[PDB]
């Protein structure tokens, strides 16, 4: 075949039969027991797997039992490791491990640690740059005619993973607490809501469950990834993240934001990654519906499982689909009212993307560390694809010329808000620029518990700072664009500061919204504020404007006036969407100086929780009863209500349905579980009805062995 | 709930704008100005197309280039009163226009046309008519726009209706100081934009062969197909103004990854349900075919992908050119070393040597600034449509800045390490010792980036550009470039120790004469003993039948011989290859490969050498008789004699020549041994000046046979 002598070796699952043709091997010993030296030492004891699983660049023991005692005078043998169907030591897919005298760091090698009557005991070491996969094992003997080799033995298959504990691996993490959280933790917390009202929920990463590590390799084989490249964090995150969004029957998850979900599970229903990854595997087709946090849970499960240090990040007021622009347009009418005809781009209340830890030998020194990777597509230089890995360190500084779509993530976090008046004659004029709305807060789960951490300054400097000025001018050099110069600037306000605030309602109630105007000038003004409240999706996309209102105001010199609006539940309850988000605008005009003041804020309606209840003996192998309790808060009969139950260690994900629930009644879910893991665990629940959804529940169960 | 407005991806899609959009409560008619007719001086003889360098497209609509003024005249229902009247022109593209993304552009009539902005100056008004000078922004989007004239009433807008006749194409403009794709001089512009014909350099370094290819960017329907292609790639219209993204997304469309791409790459030797990549005379042929079938065109290899991608780039206006690299390390995975294994006896280990260096491999170079990288990296950008494992998987590479490659700055984007490795690798000779041990004997750092050549600005000669991609052999700048690469990703697995041989200065080297197809020829190895010493050797000669990519099919001749060199001796050995050893086993491009390895017994140093030969295949004869006058008839005679001593079945002859003939093909059932078939044809030339006719032949057996003829078709 003209193209190449050997077809690509891109499937781990594919294999060939290595030919078996004085000193024979009777038995080989791997200390694969989960309580054993190997797995414990390697931090691979957590996986629900019955094969040896080691971490590259570190020693482990094996013991060959030959037919007669090996003696270093007439005997020569070596352990062989092979992956894929076309192995070449030239390509790294065929590793001959030689019995070395000592173990040279960074290089494969065997060492006879001990020998006694037909059994040499070895301490094999692997290179820190080894291909990550499931390797086949063989013992080969080089006789004076040919080579005698072992037969195919499934039970000796070895999984070699990324090793963050090894100082020579790219994936190296210098802190146990971090390696604990960032790799070992299989339960995580995703944050949502909005800046002023952060909401929490739990996600089960389930990286150690039965089947997961094998589907992660399956995903890669589906990606048809070159075996030689699976030991490279970069290419691994770069290829994996591209498989998350089912690009038409290809990827893992079909992404959807239509509040219907005509044929799958509602994105909000999902309890964790396990649920999905195993359905993907079985169906072999894309699992239906996910959104920014779902794509991010499954992906984080993919990194952690393989050994790459990862954590999900949440950005508040996120400028997605930016196309590298650092400017978001809000269109205003001549009189000051918001213009909905064209003001078509939204800032997402919040947006979730992952962060993987690794080195960047492809860029200069210093850009190593955490790499932001977003598997939620957007238009970059190649089309509509996931973005990154981008060096978080480059972003913070403006070096957007460094690869893996860095400009499109810089924008997500650094866009300006421009309020432009569109005059009735086809003219345009800019009035105000808000340089402090986008990327107002970036947060992630704390290393200790389920608390939050402000990794905000890891992405940007504080506003006003010179370093900030600098990071901006730098991005501007490498392609980031600001198509509209502020030209002049913004409205001097005539020393008039205005700003509002929304009270934090509870689903179905009413809430105030005060508005404060502070005049600083020794001047009397005449304002005319307007209020526009809409029903939006969490992405900022408006469905309907439930309330509009206008105020006529007289501002006294050095005066401070405040006025209250009352938003009646009757105004919103009918149009509400999936996560109960409401967006407000408050554009105002100061008649004297025709100055435009403008403000935005979001609110999310507090929805009640599910109550999880456990009654019993919290001992591994012991039945323990859990109860899923939900009272339909809606003063309406909820239809086709589903409840999901998950909890890595304690339960396989389960889902119960109910044809309907009478307005204000309570349903109970009874289930007995046999926990296989001990230590602090966690039960997790979700609710999904034809109506209400994004109702979550979680219990901090404690288990002993 | 994902986005307020769906993606404006198509250029073929279109929204319907209202002829009258009024709004306003109650408080002659509605007799205001009204447009009676519109005049775009779109004729080919006219000013517009000529001054815009768009007069060559066989296209009846107005084609124009961004950042430069063009003239239009609007005919109203009555005089333009600079008081009561108010109006402006509009360009809109796709189903979802937004002023924000440049998909709806309202051209304000301006007093004076400022640079970089859209504007229309009223240059002159005769009775009821107004003449405008409209200027596009240098950063405009490329594609087919829709024109509308709009009149502002105090209550809304009165506007024209969908008039397909006025649709205007806006292309890139290498003639514009501000267009990101600007070229300083005409010699280059005429060559890299306007020249619709090129030559692909192939063969082997010591036998550089040539063939013409019709880019045909100006034939009927190509422009539209180019646009159709970005549509099939769902390319956001706001991106089609970026020369980077167009070539980035455009190159990825060439190689058909099933159902998608433009061409199905194939290197087997059959080509079952398609046209052999060696038969293609040009892109025209293929693009229209793509378009009509809406499915991948079957079979293309590296020169074809580049011939098509090149037609595409030039058609839209991005300066581009095909480039052939001699001895290429494709599929390099950013490793700067290729490995050849030798058996203990010094002979080549065919079981373990699985990699290959292509005799040649052609990519494309595209010209544009690079606003995403530090200053100094603009200019020619390397782009290769022939896929190879890179950061993302098995995709094309580029645009990779040729300037970054040359100085080793491979950290700058668009798959740099990989094109760098394509031209900078070292061959490493390793004795795979029977015990399982390997030992690095030899290292030839001068085989791979040997000669990167391109067609010349003047005529059809070659132009050596090797010095653009790499510095001089073993010179400090090249030592630094190379060292910078290794710092940003490129790697060297094996180390060559401080040294790893001296070969006792017993040099070795050989030369192969090139026979014509089916003739005997000689190969000649020589030996130098540069020492006041005497040695003993054993040389090994391996002659293989390979594909143009380096992959072997068979060994038709192995030879071993003992040379005894006296001190300061220079013996010479000659081998005679009879045609009979290779004839009934040759693949498409008649490529033969040679390995020559020796063992210096005493001072057991290994010497290895490899070269490649292409057997010369005779031309096809084209003679025209008639008139070199456009519109007027002219006769074209294609003559081809079967050189082989065997009958050729299903012989496909091809004819092509942009501006002279529509690509054609005539099949012959058979050509008896040493027979001569002829193909007569009449063409009515439609372009003037220098032209070229191109022939191609492909049969069941013989294939990869070409020809041409330079005609001068005047008025």
Curated annotation (Swiss-Prot), chain A:
Its EC number is 2.3.2.13. Glycans are attached at residue 591. Changing residue 267 to R: In FA13AD; decreased intracellular protein abundance; loss of protein-glutamine gamma-glutamyltransferase activity; loss of alpha-2-antiplasmin to fibrin cross-linking activity; loss of fibrin gamma chain cross-linking activity; decreased rate of fibrin alpha chain cross-linking activity; decreased clot fiber thickness. Changing residue 518 to Q: In FA13AD; decreased intracellular protein abundance; no effect on protein-glutamine gamma-glutamyltransferase activity; no effect on alpha-2-antiplasmin to fibrin cross-linking activity; no effect on fibrin alpha chain and gamma chain cross-linking activity; decreased clot fiber thickness. One of its GO terms (cellular component) is blood microparticle. Its main location: cytoplasm. Changing residue 320 to Y: In FA13AD; mild; decreased intracellular protein abundance; loss of protein-glutamine gamma-glutamyltransferase activity; decreased alpha-2-antiplasmin to fibrin cross-linking activity; loss of fibrin gamma chain cross-linking activity; decreased rate of fibrin alpha chain cross-linking activity; decreased clot fiber thickness. Changing residue 353 to R: In FA13AD; uncertain significance. Changing residue 542 to L: In allele F13A*1A, allele F13A*2A and allele F13*(2)A. It catalyses: L-glutaminyl-[protein] + L-lysyl-[protein] = [protein]-L-lysyl-N(6)-5-L-glutamyl-[protein] + NH4(+). Keywords: Acetylation, Acyltransferase, Blood coagulation, Calcium, Cytoplasm, Disease variant, Glycoprotein, Hemostasis, Metal-binding, Secreted, Transferase, Zymogen. Residues 1-18 are annotated as: Disordered. Pfam families: Transglut_C (PF00927), Transglut_core (PF01841), Transglut_N (PF00868). Changing residue 646 to G: In FA13AD; decreased intracellular protein abundance; decreased protein-glutamine gamma-glutamyltransferase activity; decreased alpha-2-antiplasmin to fibrin cross-linking activity; decreased rate of fibrin alpha chain cross-linking activity; decreased clot fiber thickness. InterPro entries: Ig-like_fold, Ig_E-set, Papain-like_cys_pep_sf, Transglutaminase, Transglutaminase-like, Transglutaminase-like_sf, Transglutaminase_animal, Transglutaminase_AS. Factor XIII is activated by thrombin and calcium ion to a transglutaminase that catalyzes the formation of gamma-glutamyl-epsilon-lysine cross-links between fibrin chains, thus stabilizing the fibrin clot. Also cross-link alpha-2-plasmin inhibitor, or fibronectin, to the alpha chains of fibrin. Tetramer of two A chains (F13A1) and two B (F13B) chains. It is linked to Factor XIII subunit A deficiency: An autosomal recessive hematologic disorder characterized by a life-long bleeding tendency, impaired wound healing and spontaneous abortion in affected women. This is Coagulation factor XIII A chain.
């Amino acid at each position: 075949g003209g193209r190449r002598a050997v077809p690509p070796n891109n499937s781990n699952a594919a294999e060939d039969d290595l030919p078996t043709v004085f000193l024979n091997v009777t038995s080989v010993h791997l200390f694969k027991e989960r309580w054993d030296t190997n797995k414990v030492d390697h931090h691979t004891d957590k996986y629900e797997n019955n094969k040896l699983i080691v971490r590259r660049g570190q020693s482990f023991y094996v013991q060959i039992d030959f037919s007669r005692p090996y003696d270093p005078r007439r005997d020569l043998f070596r352990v062989e490791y092979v992956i894929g169907r076309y192995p070449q030591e030239n390509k790294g897919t065929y590793i001959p491990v030689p019995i070395v005298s000592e173990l040279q760091s960074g290089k494969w090698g065997a060492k006879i640690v001990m020998r006694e009557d037909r059994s040499v005991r070895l301490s094999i070491q692997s290179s820190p740059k080894c291909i990550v996969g499931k390797f086949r094992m063989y013992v080969a003997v080089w006789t004076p005619y040919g080579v005698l080799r072992t037969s195919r033995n499934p039970e000796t298959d070895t999984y070699i993973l990324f090793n963050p504990w090894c100082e020579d691996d790219a994936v190296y993490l210098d802190n146990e607490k971090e390696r604990e959280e960032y790799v070992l933790n299989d339960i995580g917390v995703i944050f949502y809501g909005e800046v002023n009202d952060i909401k929490t929920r739990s996600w089960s990463y389930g990286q150690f469950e039965d089947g997961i590590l094998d589907t992660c390799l399956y995903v890669m084989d589906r990606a048809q990834m070159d075996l030689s490249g699976r030991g490279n964090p970069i290419k691994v995150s770069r290829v994996g993240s591209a498989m998350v969004n089912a690009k038409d029957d290809e990827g893992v998850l079909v992404g959807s934001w239509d509040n219907i979900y005509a044929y799958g599970v509602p994105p909000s229903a999902w309890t964790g990654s396990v649920d999905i990854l195993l359905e993907y595997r079985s169906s072999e087709n894309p699992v239906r519906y996910g959104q920014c946090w779902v794509f991010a849970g499954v992906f984080n499960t993919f990194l952690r499982c393989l050994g790459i240090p990862a954590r999900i990040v949440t950005n508040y007021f996120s400028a997605h689909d930016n196309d590298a622009n650092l400017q978001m347009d809000i269109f205003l009418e001549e009189d000051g009212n918001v213009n909905s005809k064209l003001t078509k781009d939204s800032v997402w209340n919040y947006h979730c993307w992952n962060e993987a830890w690794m080195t960047r030998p492809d860029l200069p020194v210093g850009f190593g560390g955490w790499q932001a990777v977003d598997s939620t597509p957007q238009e970059n230089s190649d089309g509509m694809y996931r973005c990154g890995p981008a060096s978080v360190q480059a972003i913070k500084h403006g070096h957007v010329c460094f690869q893996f779509d860095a400009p499109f993530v810089f924008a997500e976090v650094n866009s300006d808000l421009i309020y432009i008046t569109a005059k009735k004659d086809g003219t345009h004029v800019v009035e105000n620029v808000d340089a402090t709305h986008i990327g107002k807060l970036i947060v992630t789960k704390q290393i200790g518990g389920d608390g939050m951490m402000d990794i905000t300054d890891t992405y940007k400097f504080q506003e006003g700072q010179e370093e900030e000025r600098l990071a901006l001018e730098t991005a501007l050099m490498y392609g980031a664009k600001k198509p509209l110069n502020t030209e002049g600037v913004m409205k001097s306000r005539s020393n008039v500061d205005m700003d509002f605030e929304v009270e934090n309602a509870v689903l179905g109630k009413d809430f105030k919204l005060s508005i404060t105007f502070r005049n600083n000038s020794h001047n009397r003004y005449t304002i005319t504020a307007y209020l526009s409240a809409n029903i939006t999706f969490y992405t900022g996309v408006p469905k309907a404007e439930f309330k509009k209102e206008t105020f006529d105001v007289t501002l006294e010199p050095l005066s401070f006036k405040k006025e209250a609006v009352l938003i009646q539940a009757g105004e919103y309850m009918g149009q509400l969407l999936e996560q109960a988000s409401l967006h407000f605008f408050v554009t105002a005009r100061i008649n004297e100086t025709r100055d435009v003041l403008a403000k935005q804020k979001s609110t999310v309606l507090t929805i009640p929780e599910i109550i999880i209840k456990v009654r019993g003996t919290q001992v591994v192998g012991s039945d323990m009863t859990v109860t899923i309790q939900f009272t339909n808060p809606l003063k309406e009969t909820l239809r086709n209500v589903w409840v999901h139950l998950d909890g890595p260690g304690v339960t396989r994900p389960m889902k119960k349905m109910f044809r309907e629930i009478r307005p204000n009644s309570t349903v109970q879910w009874e289930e007995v579980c046999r926990p296989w893991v001990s230590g602090h665990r966690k039960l997790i629940a979700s609710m999904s009805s034809d109506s209400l959804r994004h109702v979550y529940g979680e219990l901090d169960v404690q288990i002993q062995r």
